[PDB]
Design a protein around this ligand. Structure first.
Ligand SMILES: OC[C@H]1O[C@@](CO)(O[C@H]2O[C@H](CO)[C@@H](O)[C@H](O)[C@H]2O)[C@@H](O)[C@@H]1O
Lengths: 68, 66
């Protein structure tokens, strides 16, 4: 239910696909990826901690833009 | 031991991401070739560990050999 927003420095479509893959693997998420604006929105019951950790697995620089 | 992997990187940012996860793992010496989508790693870590570390990035990875 909570709606989180993250900054992920994706710089190509492949970067976006990889973010998609780690989120798909985690599961229990509803996400939206805005490549041009380096933003990823995630609606999930998973803690912000878990979402942050999952996104960091990509090797990309990740920051929190907060709750919607 | 020098392992070679195929990693589907499509921009400099993709290579940097690979570099960061390998650095986090530690104990590795590596070289990344973006145009040829290849990553070579010399480390004491096992085959599976290196593979899992690369796979967790969300990129398509396959082992090529030694
Ligand atoms: O995802 C990046 C990857 O896409 C390719 C096509 O395989 O190029 C596309 O994306 C570029 C931006 O990253 C565009 O400039 C280009 O016009 C478009 O075809 C690869 O060249 C690139 O590695």
């Amino acid at each position: 239910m909570p709606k989180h927003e993250f900054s992920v420095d994706m710089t190509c479509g492949g970067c976006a696909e990889a973010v998609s893959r780690v989120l798909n693997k985690l599961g229990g998420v509803k996400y939206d990826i805005d490549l041009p604006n380096k933003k990823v929105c995630i609606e999930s019951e998973h803690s912000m901690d878990t979402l942050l950790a999952t996104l960091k697995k990509t090797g990309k620089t990740v920051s929190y833009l907060g709750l919607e």
